[PDB]
């Protein structure tokens, strides 16, 4: 149950906020879970998706075990494009099929200084939380 008297349970308000969130909030919404091995080796459960990460598709018509590289993150439509998840149009052109990041599992992150800083921050937060809990 929610006890904070300054956040809503209003369905309409939550939908409006989600569909009108600015880009830097779209980034936070567009988060995907790391694989089992990455999760074990980083102590971090999820990471906002980036443009050049290897991922897998877990649900839908394109689910499988193949490793695909993200092509572009289309924040306006809340979908991401992978390098070989695509269908065939009528004329013969191949266009990409959008997939929600919540149905995708990250396989190998694109590391830079800021990404590493995010990972270490999340790891430290989970460590302090576990110390408090136990």
């Amino acid at each position: 149950m929610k006890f904070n008297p300054f956040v809503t349970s209003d369905r309409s308000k939550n939908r409006k906020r989600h569909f009108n969130a600015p880009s830097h909030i779209r980034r936070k919404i567009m988060s995907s879970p790391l694989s089992k091995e990455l999760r074990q080796k980083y102590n971090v459960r999820s990471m906002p998706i980036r443009k050049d990460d290897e991922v897998q598709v877990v649900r839908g018509h394109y689910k499988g075990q193949q490793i695909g590289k993200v092509v572009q993150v289309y924040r306006k439509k809340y979908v991401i494009y992978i390098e070989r998840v695509q269908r065939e149009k009528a004329n013969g052109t191949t266009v990409h099929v959008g997939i929600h990041p919540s149905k995708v599992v990250i396989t190998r992150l694109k590391l830079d200084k800021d990404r590493k800083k995010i990972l270490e921050r999340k790891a430290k937060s989970r460590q302090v939380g576990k110390e408090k809990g136990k």
Binding site: M1, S9, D10, R11
Partner: protein, 257 residues
């Protein structure tokens, strides 16, 4: 509804003649909304019959004596297995219906150990019934933050708090109650009596002092004593088939003519 809703327009009746129905019409204008019909409950737009007002008598008033009467009746009904099972609780494996546990329970702080306590007391089937009863509400209530519904489960009564509410509040269907602040709204949900109750030893001891006995009046109420019985022996069959009564009757006539 809004007090000025349906009255924004300036509109007057066209009068008799011109083969229209004497209802007010919107004034002039080169638009569809022109001479169309403005005021009156039967027109599209315009006010309704008796616009609702905020000063309707929303709240009600009940005497303290009969509020306490109802609380006493609900507590009395909550100690009968027939009434509790009729209300629908799965109390078949419960050892004794006025379920009292020691005061160490009041010091729990983990939902896990609260769940273990419920499992050992064999009240877990009621929470499983609540899990089964979780479904989606019917009608236009979904669009108004009343999307999900579920069944009410057993109620926990504590004398004083040491983490009991923290431990139990996550489990569905559980209602934590202070012994000194019992309300009929949560003791007898839906207007029906016989909710399954789990008590603690200290609260159970204090309840007697709270509501008084037949001889001893309530000490935590300024002036209160338990309500009396209009008839004591409610065993009607036992009364009827007793020697003193059965002596003074005429012979039955059961010959159909």
């Amino acid at each position: 509804v809004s007090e000025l809703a349906g009255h924004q327009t300036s509109a007057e009746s066209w009068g008799t003649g011109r083969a229209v129905a004497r209802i007010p019409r919107v004034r002039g204008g080169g638009t569809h909304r022109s001479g169309q019909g403005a005021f009156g409950n039967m027109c599209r737009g315009g006010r309704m019959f008796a616009p609702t007002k905020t000063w309707r008598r929303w709240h009600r008033r009940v005497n303290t004596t009969q509020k306490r009467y109802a609380i006493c009746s609900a507590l009395a009904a909550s100690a009968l297995p027939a009434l509790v099972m009729s209300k629908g609780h799965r109390i078949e494996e419960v050892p004794e219906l006025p379920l009292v546990v020691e005061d160490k329970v009041e010091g729990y702080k983990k939902t896990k150990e609260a769940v273990l306590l419920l499992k050992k007391l064999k009240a877990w089937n009621d929470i499983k019934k609540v899990y089964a009863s979780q479904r989606m509400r019917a009608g236009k209530g979904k669009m108004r933050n009343r999307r999900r519904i579920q069944r009410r489960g057993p109620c926990v009564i504590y004398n004083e708090d040491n983490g009991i509410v923290k431990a139990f509040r996550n489990i569905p269907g559980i209602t934590l109650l202070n012994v000194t602040k019992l309300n009929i709204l949560k003791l007898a949900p839906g207007g029906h009596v016989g909710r399954f109750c789990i008590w603690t030893e200290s609260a159970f001891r204090k309840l007697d002092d709270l509501y008084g006995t037949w001889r001893k009046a309530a000490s935590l109420k300024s002036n209160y004593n338990l309500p009396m019985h209009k008839m004591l022996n409610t065993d009607l069959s036992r009364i009827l088939k007793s020697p003193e009564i059965q002596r003074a009757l005429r012979a039955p006539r059961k010959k159909i003519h």
